[PDB]
Amino acid sequence: KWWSAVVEERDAQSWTISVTTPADAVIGHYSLLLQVSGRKQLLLGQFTLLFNPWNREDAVFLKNEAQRMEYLLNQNGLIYLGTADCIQAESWDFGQFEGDVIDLSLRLLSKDKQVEKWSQPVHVARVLGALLHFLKEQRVLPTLLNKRRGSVPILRQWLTGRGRPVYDGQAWVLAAVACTVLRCLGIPARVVTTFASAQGTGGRLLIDEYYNEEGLQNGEGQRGRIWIFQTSTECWMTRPALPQGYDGWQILHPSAGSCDLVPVRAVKEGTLGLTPAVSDLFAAINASCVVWKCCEDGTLELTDSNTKYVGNNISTKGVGSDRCEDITQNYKYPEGSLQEKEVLERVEKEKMERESPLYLLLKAPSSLPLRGDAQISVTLVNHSEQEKAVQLAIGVQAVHYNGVLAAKLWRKKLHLTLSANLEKIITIGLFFSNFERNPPENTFLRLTAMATHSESNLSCFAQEDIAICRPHLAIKMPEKAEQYQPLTASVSLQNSLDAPMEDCVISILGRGLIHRERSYRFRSVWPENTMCAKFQFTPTHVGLQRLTVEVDCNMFQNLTNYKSVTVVAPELSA
Amino acid sequence: QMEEPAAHDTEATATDYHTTSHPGTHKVYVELQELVMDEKNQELRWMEAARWVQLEENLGENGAWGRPHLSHLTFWSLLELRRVFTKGTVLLDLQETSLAGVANQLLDRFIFEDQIRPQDREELLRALLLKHSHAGELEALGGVKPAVLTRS
Amino acid sequence: EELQDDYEDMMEENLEQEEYEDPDIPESQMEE
Amino acid sequence: LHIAAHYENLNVAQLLLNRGASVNFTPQNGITPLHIASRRGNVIMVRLLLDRGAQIETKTKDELTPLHCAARNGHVRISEILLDHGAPIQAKTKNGLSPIHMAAQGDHLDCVRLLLQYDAEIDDITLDHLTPLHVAAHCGHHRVAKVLLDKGAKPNSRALNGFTPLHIACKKNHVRVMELLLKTGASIDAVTESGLTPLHVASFMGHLPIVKNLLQRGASPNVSNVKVETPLHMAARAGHTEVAKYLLQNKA
């Protein structure tokens, strides 16, 4: 159970020696030396020591073999982006077993001078999370430009300053980079996406949103915003320095700096005080949104708004598949339940001790096709005995994933009268061609509806986030394939846009299938036509491989889809 | 069954595959092998022709290695080598551990660069995966003559 | 510690026979 | 072998099976090693046991199949492996629970998705006539309810006492399930066998947000039970002053 060596087999000229290391050994580069009496030290060689999720006595022990392969051995990951109602899975190459990744990770860890603590997964994860957040802050530039090739080139650029820099539109790659480093060092890790994340509140459970009388937002945004999504790194280890019962998944939460490891259970149960970052993570998925109307006079009026739920569809890649796993129940109790009520009341108590006739219903589709067409419905009901003169403002605005507005796209102003006690439904067409400008890439649509009536001083408000739907990239490939034999994959793309696809580039890659990548040019695709293209390649690595296809054109860029294939060893012959 | 796309020359992503690891300093051993034919079975194979350790040794038509010598080059050797290297296909940091894996990835890249036709791949793959004999087997093989690969 | 799992009661609690049973289908009748 | 399957100890399990251990050993409780491996999410143990001849349709004392145990704990890969080996997707427990009911009970969204993809009956009923939508409304799992409604689950299914999923959501203060059901054509005026509307149930339970949302969407507060008892009667009987005040401020 400690450092030891025993001769297992021996001939007259050689010894077969079995060498053990302790389950709590310091990780990193090791030198092995042999001392013979009457002789000076002899260097036998060098080896690298890693955390061991396969060992029962290790702090990173994982109970399940399938969980072990998924959370440590799988280099083909999935990062979930988009919105809660339209989740887009982007294929991500973690690449933690690339040749230079282990050296880069250990070199980054060498910035910490408490080498005796390198035997502790908690300490290593904390130090690496803090250092990677610092590197992200230093290297990610303000806003192809968004073409990504996994965590490894990002790590190389962050550590050496050489390569393609990442821009702030994809600052969410920090979670994937941290996952790659932790997986390479032997700490099981996964990337978790939280949709509608209330970031920047500093533990406060309130979010203030400000809209003008057109239903649009003027300034670049507040400090506390509800991000369309946020990524995070979860890692698996015991917590010896915490009270018993907090072993398991831990959230890496950098703070502008220093990083903290928060058990997921602490976030779920509102155990504010177990670690310093529990309050911020709890507020990220439990805050309530308050909407203010900004008048032209300067009055900042309170608004009767629809409930904007936070912490939705907390998602991560499923074990042993490309399916999506929902883990929201690890982080929150069901809304309106008894346990959620108790947790919320306890947190409110701790924070307190430490310190109308109109009703609007908005129906929107979860996604709007690119250059496409959509229908939205506004339901207005009058509860007064007098008929109401109401001004309905509809606004469409482009927002980045971190809640920062990008462009005002559309505005509509209706003037309607409703009879007393009469529901009325107003159907409005949401058309791309009506936008005053094209939405920026990797932005989402903030649809708003504001109903104001007479001089009641209160306005009805509703908002929804709409993802932009791009044409589906269909990949057709056999499920199984034999090693060292040609394998054909056909790719189909239907041009559902109103303009031709020009300057068309298709790129194929995948570890164990294609060396680096191959970019091709295919013909321009007229509207309502279909691109069909075949690619012949020979897989050379046995196992579950993934083919990743990326299509670029003048209409859209970095449209990526993937398909998995199991490569089998060739049949045994003579 | 309609369209085969045309290769696009693009280096916008080339730096994403550049490793940060400094390669070690290694001495080199070079072996030159030629595609040949044997008397006994008329079977095509690869045959050791020359080797470089400190100087150049060439394998004679007796099975014995010749006298070590400095490696002189013909003028035409360096002229055509520069021409084929200018258009050459390079696979750098190729993650392969078998000859069949190397040969398949090289031939796929040969087609992508339009160095060979898609109809030539099968003949080249069969050629590159032939038996790689060595100098000790030359006596037992009944000798060796040079040979030329044909599409058949 | 590190040897409690060698005993029959602790093993019984670890195997969780109650997790292989259909516990109940609760209705919680509104009237009384 | 049961212990080895519980801890996914592959080596000792292989040794035991090679020395003649029964892969199908059923104790009195009926818990086979396959049941244990499926419950614990041990994919490799499940594959090993299935390769050595473990039976896929064995029931426990409460008639739980290994697919029931996999779906109850949301093990998608194990559920797919069992289904591909012939596990009956419509097997029922003693209370009439199919694996989709178990997956809905555990808020296991991807397990529900996989079961629906494998032709699970979306409107299968228990002995209490509970659909998976009824279960998702009872537990407050609005994501499971969204998956079920998008796949065609009937929003107005009746339980034994006439309760709809809307009734159950209003009972348990599950406002997200409520908005989801009312968004996908659930009747806001449906009555139980006793004539209880969702507003009746919410007023009796004192769930203020449910009452507010129901009245804002156009629910009449003057409906009556089998006995002539309005929601205001229920609020007065249960002493919910805020619910009764919002009722009286409306047209009650």
Side-chain angles (χ1 to χ4, degrees), chain A residues 1-142 144-217 219 221-254 256-574, chain B residues 3-8 12-21 23-24 26 28-152, chain C residues 3 6-17 19-23 26 30, chain D:
Chain A
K1 302 342 297 153
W2 196 65
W3 294 93
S4 77
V6 61
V7 166
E8 313 279 59
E9 205 38 89
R10 47 192 196 81
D11 42 64
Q13 288 287 33
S14 65
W15 293 353
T16 305
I17 296 145
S18 179
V19 180
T20 54
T21 71
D24 64 329
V26 169
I27 61 140
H29 301 301
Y30 273 81
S31 271
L32 189 56
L33 301 116
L34 168 90
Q35 285 105 282
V36 179
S37 17
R39 201 196 44 90
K40 20 271 328 209
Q41 240 180 9
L42 168 94
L43 172 66
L44 299 181
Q46 321 264 3
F47 69 95
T48 303
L49 200 45
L50 297 185
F51 293 108
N52 199 341
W54 283 263
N55 189 48
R56 263 217 308 181
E57 313 50 44
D58 202 308
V60 296
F61 176 60
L62 254 183
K63 274 200 307 300
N64 231 303
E65 182 62 47
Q67 278 175 49
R68 283 189 293 256
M69 323 175 268
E70 185 45 50
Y71 300 134
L72 203 85
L73 295 181
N74 198 1
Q75 298 179 91
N76 292 336
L78 295 166
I79 311 308
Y80 291 96
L81 317 176
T83 54
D85 292 321
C86 190
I87 298 174
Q88 285 111 255
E90 304 266 35
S91 74
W92 190 267
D93 177 27
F94 280 121
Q96 71 260 10
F97 300 134
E98 185 56 39
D100 59 329
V101 168
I102 184 56
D103 292 332
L104 288 181
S105 301
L106 283 177
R107 193 177 343 300
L108 189 57
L109 179 59
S110 91
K111 253 70 100 183
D112 162 77
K113 274 54 197 129
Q114 315 187 89
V115 290
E116 70 282 344
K117 297 219 185 77
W118 292 11
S119 66
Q120 298 169 39
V122 170
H123 176 82
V124 173
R126 273 215 276 261
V127 157
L128 290 176
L131 286 167
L132 280 170
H133 181 87
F134 178 82
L135 287 170
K136 189 226 56 156
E137 292 292 348
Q138 267 36 75
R139 300 276 202 209
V140 167
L141 306 180
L144 287 131
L145 258 192
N146 285 280
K147 194 183 294 303
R148 292 272 73 75
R149 294 286 189 263
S151 307
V152 176
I154 300 183
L155 186 64
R156 289 171 178 152
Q157 202 270 328
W158 284 4
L159 282 180
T160 88
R162 285 189 326 272
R164 305 207 281 112
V166 176
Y167 288 78
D168 60 21
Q170 298 173 311
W172 47 263
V173 301
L174 170 63
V177 170
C179 188
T180 278
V181 167
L182 295 177
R183 279 193 191 181
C184 104
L185 285 178
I187 291 173
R190 59 191 189 170
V191 176
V192 171
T193 296
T194 301
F195 299 93
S197 184
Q199 291 293 312
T201 67
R204 298 177 20 81
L205 295 181
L206 287 170
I207 283 273
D208 307 309
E209 289 182 2
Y210 297 87
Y211 296 82
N212 56 29
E213 255 149 359
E214 307 185 323
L216 300 164
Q217 309 195 76
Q222 309 302 293
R223 190 173 271 74
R225 303 186 307 276
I226 294 159
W227 292 24
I228 271 74
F229 70 83
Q230 172 67 294
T231 55
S232 37
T233 307
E234 267 190 12
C235 53
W236 178 274
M237 70 206 53
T238 74
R239 300 297 305 265
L242 298 190
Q244 191 271 316
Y246 288 108
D247 297 10
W249 285 114
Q250 325 287 316
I251 307 144
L252 268 178
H253 191 249
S258 208
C259 197
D260 185 37
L261 259 197
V262 182
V264 171
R265 179 153 99 63
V267 176
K268 197 189 164 152
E269 291 158 3
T271 315
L272 270 65
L274 182 84
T275 79
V278 180
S279 186
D280 278 39
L281 289 172
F282 187 86
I285 59 174
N286 290 280
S288 70
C289 182
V290 175
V291 179
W292 296 90
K293 176 172 63 169
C294 313
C295 301
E296 266 60 66
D297 203 312
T299 342
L300 213 64
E301 223 62 80
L302 195 272
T303 257
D304 174 40
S305 50
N306 82 298
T307 303
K308 177 143 158 202
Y309 293 108
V310 293
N312 296 291
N313 297 102
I314 295 186
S315 293
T316 202
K317 179 173 178 299
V319 167
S321 67
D322 304 293
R323 311 186 57 95
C324 185
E325 197 71 57
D326 206 284
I327 60 176
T328 316
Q329 73 178 117
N330 302 158
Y331 285 78
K332 318 150 57 57
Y333 290 108
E335 265 97 330
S337 55
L338 281 196
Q339 300 110 278
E340 189 224 6
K341 162 207 55 63
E342 177 273 316
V343 173
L344 260 300
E345 268 164 6
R346 179 163 35 76
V347 174
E348 299 335 279
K349 196 174 80 263
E350 207 283 311
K351 262 128 161 57
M352 227 78 186
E353 288 199 295
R354 205 226 72 256
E355 199 201 66
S356 201
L358 207 29
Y359 166 69
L360 193 149
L361 173 57
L362 186 62
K363 309 198 127 53
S366 45
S367 84
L368 170 58
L370 178 59
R371 306 282 326 151
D373 260 324
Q375 295 279 305
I376 61 134
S377 157
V378 174
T379 316
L380 300 183
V381 316
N382 181 347
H383 291 95
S384 91
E385 287 314 83
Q386 314 134 87
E387 66 166 18
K388 210 133 305 310
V390 194
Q391 213 213 64
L392 178 70
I394 316 281
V396 184
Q397 197 169 351
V399 301
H400 296 288
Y401 91 100
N402 63 344
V404 179
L405 320 153
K408 285 173 209 63
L409 306 183
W410 195 50
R411 64 201 69 200
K412 184 63 171 302
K413 181 71 83 221
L414 285 323
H415 300 268
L416 319 98
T417 36
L418 315 93
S419 318
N421 287 264
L422 177 59
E423 182 177 88
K424 141 171 282 300
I425 310 185
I426 312 290
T427 307
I428 314 148
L430 185 44
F431 305 167
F432 249 81
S433 55
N434 278 321
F435 291 174
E436 317 170 37
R437 71 208 82 260
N438 248 318
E441 57 71 8
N442 303 146
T443 60
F444 306 88
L445 299 203
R446 172 68 53 74
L447 172 78
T448 53
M450 188 162 267
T452 165
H453 51 289
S454 61
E455 205 285 89
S456 194
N457 259 15
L458 188 50
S459 298
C460 292
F461 181 82
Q463 62 174 297
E464 286 298 330
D465 318 281
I466 308 165
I468 294 155
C469 202
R470 302 203 284 183
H472 174 250
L473 200 48
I475 301 148
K476 169 174 316 332
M477 206 165 52
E479 196 84 29
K480 309 259 150 26
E482 160 161 17
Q483 190 193 22
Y484 304 140
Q485 295 295 330
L487 160 84
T488 293
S490 54
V491 165
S492 293
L493 189 50
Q494 213 290 325
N495 187 8
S496 45
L497 320 170
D498 48 19
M501 297 173 52
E502 313 254 347
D503 318 306
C504 291
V505 181
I506 177 152
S507 311
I508 56 172
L509 57 90
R511 178 181 314 275
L513 299 174
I514 302 158
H515 172 74
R516 311 192 165 191
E517 64 194 70
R518 280 184 251 135
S519 283
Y520 297 82
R521 263 185 263 91
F522 58 103
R523 284 177 290 281
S524 294
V525 194
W526 279 97
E528 295 337 303
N529 290 49
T530 300
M531 176 258 291
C532 329
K534 281 118 191 64
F535 304 94
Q536 226 199 11
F537 54 95
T538 291
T540 55
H541 292 61
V542 171
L544 176 51
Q545 319 293 351
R546 185 212 265 154
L547 173 73
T548 297
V549 187
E550 178 190 83
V551 169
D552 305 313
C553 71
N554 70 323
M555 287 312 261
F556 51 84
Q557 294 89 43
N558 308 299
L559 175 60
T560 302
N561 201 25
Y562 64 90
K563 182 166 206 293
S564 304
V565 52
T566 296
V567 178
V568 299
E571 201 70 88
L572 269 177
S573 63
Chain B
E3 176 192 39
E4 211 98 3
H8 187 42
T13 311
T15 58
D16 286 28
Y17 301 107
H18 291 178
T19 191
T20 38
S21 267
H26 297 277
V28 75
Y29 167 81
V30 195
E31 193 180 282
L32 178 54
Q33 293 195 351
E34 286 206 74
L35 203 59
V36 307
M37 229 203 310
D38 55 71
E39 284 78 350
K40 196 200 315 302
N41 308 334
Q42 229 59 54
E43 190 191 56
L44 257 286
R45 77 204 309 117
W46 294 97
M47 192 48 255
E48 218 166 11
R51 73 183 168 204
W52 286 253
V53 176
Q54 325 213 264
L55 284 184
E56 182 188 331
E57 298 169 76
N58 313 98
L59 184 65
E61 274 297 299
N62 40 343
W65 290 92
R67 267 178 308 114
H69 56 92
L70 205 75
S71 318
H72 67 280
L73 302 182
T74 77
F75 178 80
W76 309 114
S77 279
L78 288 168
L79 199 142
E80 325 313 334
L81 184 55
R82 197 186 68 114
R83 263 227 326 279
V84 297
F85 222 155
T86 298
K87 334 158 58 206
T89 288
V90 295
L91 295 179
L92 301 172
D93 298 308
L94 180 68
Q95 288 168 243
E96 292 294 335
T97 44
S98 96
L99 184 62
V102 172
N104 282 286
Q105 290 291 339
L106 175 63
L107 281 183
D108 273 347
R109 201 78 203 185
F110 269 154
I111 276 143
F112 183 72
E113 307 218 330
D114 199 73
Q115 284 253 265
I116 67 171
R117 276 153 325 172
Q119 43 259 38
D120 315 330
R121 201 196 174 265
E122 274 293 290
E123 202 50 74
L124 292 188
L125 186 58
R126 263 177 343 260
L128 289 168
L129 302 185
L130 291 163
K131 281 47 47 193
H132 281 259
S133 102
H134 267 186
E137 301 134 77
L138 177 69
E139 299 89 321
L141 264 166
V144 159
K145 36 216 163 283
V148 174
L149 192 81
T150 59
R151 245 201 283 118
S152 180
Chain C
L3 287 178
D6 283 329
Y7 295 82
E8 292 251 17
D9 290 346
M10 198 44 20
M11 190 43 80
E12 185 180 47
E13 261 190 0
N14 282 320
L15 293 168
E16 304 197 296
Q17 285 144 285
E19 280 323 278
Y20 302 84
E21 298 173 74
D22 221 37
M30 157 152 304
Chain D
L1 192 56
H2 284 92
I3 308 303
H6 173 95
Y7 292 102
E8 201 172 43
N9 289 337
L10 290 324
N11 296 354
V12 75
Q14 269 141 75
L15 174 60
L16 289 164
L17 286 155
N18 291 351
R19 305 297 199 81
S22 191
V23 80
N24 283 315
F25 192 91
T26 177
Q28 318 60 63
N29 59 17
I31 301 167
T32 73
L34 181 58
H35 279 105
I36 281 172
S38 321
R39 211 272 306 191
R40 298 269 304 170
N42 295 334
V43 177
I44 316 299
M45 191 63 63
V46 160
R47 295 196 144 288
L48 170 66
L49 296 174
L50 270 174
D51 280 322
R52 307 299 292 249
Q55 309 181 27
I56 207 92
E57 67 279 292
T58 301
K59 281 154 210 288
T60 61
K61 144 172 87 64
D62 282 351
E63 271 113 320
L64 271 74
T65 54
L67 182 56
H68 272 111
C69 309
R72 181 185 255 180
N73 304 85
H75 302 309
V76 179
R77 185 74 193 104
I78 292 201
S79 298
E80 191 168 59
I81 286 156
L82 300 162
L83 284 162
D84 295 332
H85 276 80
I89 205 170
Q90 291 310 131
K92 264 146 151 29
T93 74
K94 51 171 203 72
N95 294 137
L97 267 78
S98 61
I100 190 93
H101 285 105
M102 306 250 172
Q105 237 186 6
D107 199 21
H108 301 306
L109 198 53
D110 201 55
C111 212
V112 169
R113 284 212 211 85
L114 178 96
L115 287 158
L116 288 176
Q117 147 188 336
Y118 268 84
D119 303 351
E121 276 159 4
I122 199 171
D123 300 310
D124 184 64
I125 43 90
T126 68
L127 294 171
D128 296 338
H129 286 33
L130 295 193
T131 58
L133 187 51
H134 278 123
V135 175
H138 176 81
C139 303
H141 303 153
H142 64 274
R143 296 177 288 279
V144 176
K146 192 168 185 104
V147 149
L148 292 172
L149 287 160
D150 284 346
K151 287 281 163 27
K154 282 150 190 13
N156 283 318
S157 267
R158 300 304 172 131
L160 265 198
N161 43 344
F163 271 65
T164 60
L166 189 53
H167 279 120
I168 293 173
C170 293
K171 182 162 186 240
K172 309 284 295 155
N173 197 41
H174 293 144
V175 69
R176 294 194 82 176
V177 177
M178 200 210 45
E179 309 169 301
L180 201 76
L181 283 162
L182 284 164
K183 201 183 170 107
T184 280
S187 168
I188 207 179
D189 307 304
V191 301
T192 76
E193 292 336 312
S194 319
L196 288 170
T197 61
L199 185 54
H200 266 105
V201 173
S203 296
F204 181 75
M205 295 319 231
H207 302 320
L208 240 190
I210 305 277
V211 175
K212 225 159 280 273
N213 211 330
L214 282 174
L215 285 163
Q216 273 178 309
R217 294 172 115 97
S220 177
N222 303 305
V223 275
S224 300
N225 224 27
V226 281
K227 47 190 73 33
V228 277
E229 276 205 317
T230 73
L232 186 57
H233 278 106
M234 308 255 147
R237 190 169 109 228
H240 295 307
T241 314
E242 316 145 14
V243 167
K245 188 198 196 322
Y246 196 63
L247 286 196
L248 284 148
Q249 285 167 310
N250 270 267
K251 273 0 105 198

